[PDB]
């Protein structure tokens, strides 16, 4: 129990409750160290250089410095720390936009509400939130501007439900209207513990003398939004991360990709290659310095033992060969992925100009997980829909009307009974002249739009009237009657006034009684009194309830409307049937006593009132049906269809009711009319099994057709899904979910949105994306591999907690097809090239151990070897990783089947990784064996009999190994921009001018003193400029002749699209 006092901020602070801040940052000052080190030392190369630097600390291993590896290990750990500090500041800035918002708090000293910040709110404060601004915390309402004490909250962020909830104050506390009398109430609120069950609260607020009960009818959660009320008085009871909705959200977790998981298996491949070459050279050293100890006495070798010598040069060959694993790879994998996320969020085709929000990639380490996406776990309200309803169609007197007629069925075919589409203008033309039969029926329809509702209108200073509707479908019916001509104006108690724009005269209708809406009834009935003195009954409701209660002998257009109810449901529009009947006073004077039968039973009201109303709806005359559409966002059906052409299975998880989720899926074409929905709506644990078993029995009973797979769908209730996620029934649900084309989950909790995404990634080796808005799917976004949020609207708690935040749903098409499949081919090729080019230089250090008696002597100076991964081979990884477009943007969207290249993993695996190493072994053997044959005795020069020494030959090994690894990159690249022309041929021209400057200036400063006469004996020699020509072309003739044979006589599917790009 959370005992909360009402009017003393010093008393509740002794409990030490939480504050009001909401932080979506990965780190803070209390855990930046044990969390950043865990994600760096889960990479296997950073574990390798930590045990390479620990080998350089025993004394007599290698004459290179003791702090040359651990110095660079801190350098690669500083760069990856400043990137995760840059990003976590940007997450902290977006949290400052929430905690610094305005929230009016009461003051005991000032005796009036003071304006403050959100973060200053404590548990127990009395706050006053105004008309259309969101709720700051979990508050119980004390009063409101409405007379009884009710208010209307919108719960489209804590649910998906689009209607407005009636939150009312208690009548024992709604007498605190004025701000000056708020100080005289004392007492405590014995509240419940923090939960995540939204629709259940239990408390006990004791006032000055006795206790009042609490209930979820006066509990307002934090994600809600006050609406259609001027102000309320609330008491903050849960705040910050102790709320009902944001309780199970956490800090941004560590998210490793699938490319990064392959690198930890390519390092183990490279590490067991490393142990082999160390074991060869350390056995060949202990054999040769023992068998040839009589022919090596000019070295004065110690010869301690065979074991002590073997354990000594096991480490000196570790340090010499430790540069096979590149340390410059893991900075240029973090800087490429950071510079790819900057280029994603700089695209104008992913910028939403209406609310002025461009896309942002908050987590740059996941830009290649967008290239291999198997599933999409969407949300419905706000993600797929605009949360705006609109009166779309009416069908009356056997006709059917829309304003915007599409040209597919504009021709009313006149197939006996009229089916087709006519304009709303022709609706008014058959209303005007009295000679038509439908005109007594058309106005009786058109008054039912503007009178049968329960909307409370209000005027503004402009005169444009705004309607306050408790349900958005009823509000669209009034506006649908308003633009047709029957405007609804001022509502006083117990009569309704309607302004008729047809005649121009202002009418009035005496409202006698209305029966409330009930989900059990699914009707809404309203008896009225007219200027005629005549009593007519208006009734609106679903087609499945009132069509049973008609006089089919009276009305003659029932067969047309039921077929008009069939093509409306084929477009997913929400429908209601409209019925009427004239009644007399004498049956009404008794039916008033039937209403007074319900006035006698205050003890029973759900059972008594509604079927006492249904005593008079025993027979009706049908007017017709209406069709209200739930608006989807722009380009939603075009991206549901395109992402399914790419092989991505789209699920939809919502908090809405079941029947409106199917209506959405029929309108975005996620479900077709010729599809077999497998509805699983059960209430016990084993009936969910029995439903799942009979579905999966009747699927393997028959042979699956190639089109019967694409005519199968699944619909789960949130109570059935609470049983089907249990470990017993986990597999029957998943084996039927793999067969159906589209899955829809309804009534689903915020945790059950996360437990589904956890259940799919556990059982399948597939990558999942979760897109949503609102804080009901923050747990869904934090549990996926990529979490996308919707930004630009209020309540964007999912756009903060996500890795990517986009403008709207239709930007998911270019973000996956174009920017994902680019950023998978880019990072996979730039990583394999960086593994390759470290091999093609540092393997000439291994073919040299057979020509220097297994001593481990290097053939380049260690300053010049350090400049390899820092100056002359850093930019061709960057240009390949940031600017390489293997296939264009307009052809990636025309052919969505090219998404299955990354989806299978056809650019990055261990098997492709072995071919870049075996090409690196092959290229290094051409450099070595090609140069020990030319520089035979050191006798390759023509300078007065002088010879070429060790260092004049190892420059030829170094330079030829640069033109090869830069010549390999020039075959790998697909497009040649101006940034490629400075990276591949501008790193070669960099080295050819750096070396006569470095070796002529730096040896005079006692730095790399080996290079005293090397420039005269390399660059002045004619054999250097001949080894630099033929020996690269020797090694790159196999990579060039296979590139011609692969694209001509054995092509992949993207090699043809690249040829379409070049020649069309």
């Amino acid at each position: 129990p959370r005992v909360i006092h009402i009017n003393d901020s010093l008393a509740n602070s002794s409990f030490g409750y939480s504050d009001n801040h909401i932080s979506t940052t990965k780190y803070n000052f209390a855990t930046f160290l044990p969390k950043f080190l865990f994600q760096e030392f889960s990479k296997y190369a950073n574990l390798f250089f930590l045990c390479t630097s620990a080998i350089q600390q025993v004394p007599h291993v290698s004459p290179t410095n003791r702090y040359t590896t651990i110095g660079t290990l801190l350098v690669v750990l500083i760069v990856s720390a400043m990137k995760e500090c840059i990003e976590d500041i940007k997450r902290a800035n977006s949290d400052k936009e929430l905690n610094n918002s305005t929230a009016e708090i009461f003051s005991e000293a000032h005796d009036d509400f003071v304006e403050k910040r959100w973060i200053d709110i404590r548990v127990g404060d009395i706050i006053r939130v105004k008309s259309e601004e969101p709720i700051p915390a979990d508050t119980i309402i004390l009063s409101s501007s409405e007379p009884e004490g009710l208010c209307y909250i919108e719960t489209a962020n804590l649910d998906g439900e689009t209607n407005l909830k009636i939150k009312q104050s208690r009548v024992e506390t709604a007498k605190f209207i004025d701000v000056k009398t708020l100080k005289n109430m004392n007492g405590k609120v014995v509240s419940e513990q923090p939960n995540s069950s939204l629709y259940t609260y239990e408390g006990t607020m004791t006032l000055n003398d006795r206790q009042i009960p609490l209930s979820p009818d006066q509990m307002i959660l934090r994600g809600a939004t006050l609406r259609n009320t001027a102000w309320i008085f609330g008491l903050v009871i849960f705040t910050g991360h102790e709320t009902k909705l944001l309780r199970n959200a956490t800090a941004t977790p560590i998210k490793r990709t699938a490319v990064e998981k392959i690198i930890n298996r390519q390092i183990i491949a490279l590490f067991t290659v490393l142990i082999v070459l160390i074991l060869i050279s350390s056995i060949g050293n202990v054999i040769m310095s023992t068998a040839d100890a009589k022919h090596l006495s000019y070295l004065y070798l110690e010869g301690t033992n065979k074991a002590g010598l073997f354990f000594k040069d096991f480490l000196t060959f570790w340090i010499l060969f430790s540069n096979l694993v590149p340390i410059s790879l893991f900075v240029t994998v973090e800087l490429i992925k950071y510079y790819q996320a900057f280029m994603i969020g700089s695209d104008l085709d992913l910028y939403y100009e209406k609310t002025d929000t461009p896309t942002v990639v908050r987590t740059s380490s996941l830009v290649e997980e967008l290239g291999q996406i198997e599933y999409i776990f969407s949300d419905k309200t706000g993600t797929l829909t605009r949360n705006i309803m609109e009166f779309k169609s009416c069908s009356i007197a056997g006709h059917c009307y829309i304003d915007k007629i599409p040209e597919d069925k504009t021709a009313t075919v006149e197939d006996g009974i009229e089916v087709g589409y006519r304009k709303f203008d022709d609706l008014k033309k058959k209303l005007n002249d009295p000679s038509d039969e439908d005109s007594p029926i058309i106005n009786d329809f058109l008054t039912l739009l503007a009178t049968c509702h329960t909307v409370i209108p209000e005027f503004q200073s402009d005169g444009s009237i705004k309607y306050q509707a408790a349900s958005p479908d009823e509000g669209a019916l009034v506006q649908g009657g308003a633009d047709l001509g029957y405007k609804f104006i001022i509502r006083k108690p117990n009569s309704v006034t309607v302004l008729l724009e047809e005649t121009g005269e202002e009418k009035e209708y005496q409202l006698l009684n209305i029966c409330e809406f009930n989900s059990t009834r699914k009707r809404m009935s309203a008896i009225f009194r007219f200027p005629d003195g005549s009593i007519k009954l208006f009734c609106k409701g679903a087609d499945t309830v009132i069509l049973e209660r008609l006089d089919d002998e009276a009305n003659q257009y029932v067969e047309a409307t039921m077929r008009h109810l069939e093509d409306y449901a084929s477009e997913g529009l929400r429908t209601l049937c409209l019925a009427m009947r004239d009644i007399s006073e004498g049956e009404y004077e008794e039916w008033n006593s039937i209403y007074n039968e319900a006035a006698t039973t205050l003890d029973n009201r759900a059972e008594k009132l509604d079927e006492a109303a249904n005593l008079i709806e025993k027979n009706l005359i049908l007017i017709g049906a209406t069709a209200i559409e739930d608006k989807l966002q722009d380009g939603v059906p075009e991206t549901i269809h395109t992402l399914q052409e790419a092989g991505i299975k789209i699920w939809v998880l919502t908090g809405d009711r079941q029947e409106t989720a199917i209506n959405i899926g029929m309108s975005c074409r996620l479900l077709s009319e010729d599809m077999n929905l497998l509805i699983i709506n059960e209430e016990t644990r084993d009936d969910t099994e029995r439903n799942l078993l009979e579905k999966i029995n009747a699927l393997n009973e028959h042979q699956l057709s190639t089109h019967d797979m694409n005519t199968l769908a699944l619909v789960i209730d949130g109570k059935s899904l609470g049983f089907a996620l249990e470990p017993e029934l986990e597999d029957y649900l998943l084996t039927v979910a793999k067969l159906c084309k589209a899955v829809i989950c309804c009534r689903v909790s915020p945790l059950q949105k996360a437990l589904v995404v956890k259940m799919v990634k556990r059982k399948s080796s597939s990558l999942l994306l979760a897109i949503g808005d609102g804080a009901n799917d923050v747990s869904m976004i934090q549990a996926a591999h990529v979490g996308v949020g919707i930004s630009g609207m209020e309540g964007m708690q999912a756009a903060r907690s996500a890795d990517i935040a986009v403008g709207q749903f239709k930007f998911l098409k270019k973000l996956l097809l174009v920017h994902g499949s680019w950023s998978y081919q880019r990072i996979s090729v730039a990583i394999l090239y960086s593994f390759y080019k470290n091999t093609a230089l540092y393997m000439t250090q291994f073919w040299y151990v057979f020509a220097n008696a297994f001593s481990g002597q290097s053939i380049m100076e260690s300053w010049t070897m350090s400049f390899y991964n820092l100056f002359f081979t850093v930019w061709p990884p960057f240009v390949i990783g940031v600017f390489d477009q293997f296939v264009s943007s307009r052809l990636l969207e025309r052919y969505p089947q090219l998404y299955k290249l990354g989806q299978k993993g056809q650019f990055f695996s261990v098997y492709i990784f072995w071919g870049w190493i075996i090409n690196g072994f092959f290229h290094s053997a051409i450099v070595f064996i090609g140069t020990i044959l030319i520089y035979r005795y050191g006798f390759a020069l023509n300078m007065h009999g002088e010879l070429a020494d060790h260092w004049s030959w190892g420059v030829t090994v170094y330079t030829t190994s640069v033109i090869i690894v830069l010549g390999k990159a020039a075959l790998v690249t697909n497009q040649w921009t101006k940034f490629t022309l400075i990276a591949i041929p501008g790193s070669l021209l960099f080295w050819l001018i750096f070396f006569p400057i470095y070796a002529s200036i730096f040896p005079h400063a006692n730095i790399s003193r080996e290079y005293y006469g090397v420039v005269k004996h390399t660059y002045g020699s004619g054999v250097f400029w001949l080894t630099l020509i033929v020996l690269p072309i020797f090694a790159l003739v196999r990579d060039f002749l296979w590139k011609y044979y692969k694209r001509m006589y054995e092509p992949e599917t993207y090699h043809v699209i690249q040829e379409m790009q070049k020649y069309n």
């Binding site: 070295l299 695209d347 481990g856 477009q885 009999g945 010879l947 005293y1012 006589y1049």
Partner: protein, 340 residues
């Protein structure tokens, strides 16, 4: 448009790019063009390596195999010669001993033609690990410069040859201790009507080695020779016994360590006049024993080429790439016609 990203060619990832394709109109005229330029360089670099004419005599095992009294014939395996003409008299050795245990091998070869270009004299050492990691760095670069470096301020790369009896070894380390000391006589002494052919011992080393190696600045009271120099300098160093390593070109040539276990080292040359044809003799006093390293010391008499000797391995590599590119220019052309 405050937060709208810029509409430039760089930010919108639409840069002016060129896309290469490996069409048969591009790849096949490349391989024919590469083959027709790597063959004139391939034949041009084999003719230049054929034009080099030399003579190599492996004078290891002259200690035991040679004859003391008369010139007898050297075996077939020790001689390797390349000349524009044929030789009539195969080369002969003789062992010649002086007053105290100092033998000199007397090779007597024949030069069948006037070698009109410059003559260089090397010695080829095989199975000597000049490129060992313990060996390459084992000297002190300040003693080479000439300054009197003290004992504990001296380098530590001289691991066992740093100091002896607490005195400073002046040429320090392993590269100077194991110096090759077979003294090649500075004249090709002509036998039977051919004149003598004088050789020189100056400007052998690199020009940066003649500038860095300077005369030392210790007096001899502090220093001591290396352990394998004591037969040349008995009783230590005196002031007139001191070797300047500035004018000692054979020290600078040996200290410039080689890349491979089979290396040349230049010893003598004449670049002014050509040697005419005739029978010559080279006296080589045998100080350096081959049991120290286990290989073959040898006497090489070479000429220079553009690539610097008789080495076919550069002109052959220009012919393999010209042969590979002209083979697959045929394999991919018969597939272009008979398998479209």
């Amino acid at each position: 448009t405050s937060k709208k990203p810029p509409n430039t060619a760089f930010r919108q990832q639409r840069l002016k790019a060129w896309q290469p394709i490996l069409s048969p109109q591009s790849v096949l005229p490349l391989l024919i063009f590469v083959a027709c330029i790597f063959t004139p360089i391939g034949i041009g670099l084999i003719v230049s390596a054929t034009k080099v004419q030399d003579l190599t005599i492996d004078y290891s095992h002259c200690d035991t195999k040679a004859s003391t009294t008369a010139f007898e014939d050297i075996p077939k395996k020790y001689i390797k010669y390349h000349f524009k003409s044929k030789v009539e008299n195969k080369p002969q050795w003789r062992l010649t001993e002086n007053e105290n245990g100092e033998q000199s091998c007397e090779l007597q070869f024949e030069i069948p033609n006037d070698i009109k270009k410059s003559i260089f004299i090397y010695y080829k050492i095989t199975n000597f690990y000049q490129n060992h990691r313990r060996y390459v760095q084992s000297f002190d670069t300040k003693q080479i410069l000439g300054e009197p470096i003290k004992k504990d301020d001296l380098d530590t790369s001289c691991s066992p040859i740093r100091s002896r009896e607490d005195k400073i070894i002046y040429p320090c380390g392993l590269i100077a201790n194991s110096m090759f000391n077979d003294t090649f006589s500075q004249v090709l002494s002509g036998i039977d009507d051919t004149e003598d052919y004088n050789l020189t011992n100056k400007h052998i080393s690199w020009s940066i080695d003649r500038h860095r190696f300077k005369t030392t600045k210790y007096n001899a009271s502090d220093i001591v020779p290396p352990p394998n120099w004591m037969k040349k300098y008995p009783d230590g160093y005196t002031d007139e016994n001191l070797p300047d390593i500035h004018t000692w070109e054979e020290f600078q040539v040996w200290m410039r360590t080689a890349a491979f276990p089979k290396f040349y080292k230049l010893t003598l040359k004449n670049e002014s006049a050509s040697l005419p044809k005739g029978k010559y003799q080279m006296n080589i006093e045998l100080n350096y024993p081959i049991s120290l390293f286990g290989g073959t010391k040898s006497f090489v008499l070479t000429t220079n080429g553009a690539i610097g000797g008789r080495n076919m391995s550069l002109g052959v590599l220009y012919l393999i790439v010209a042969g590979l590119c002209a083979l697959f220019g045929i394999i991919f052309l018969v597939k272009l016609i008979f398998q479209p």
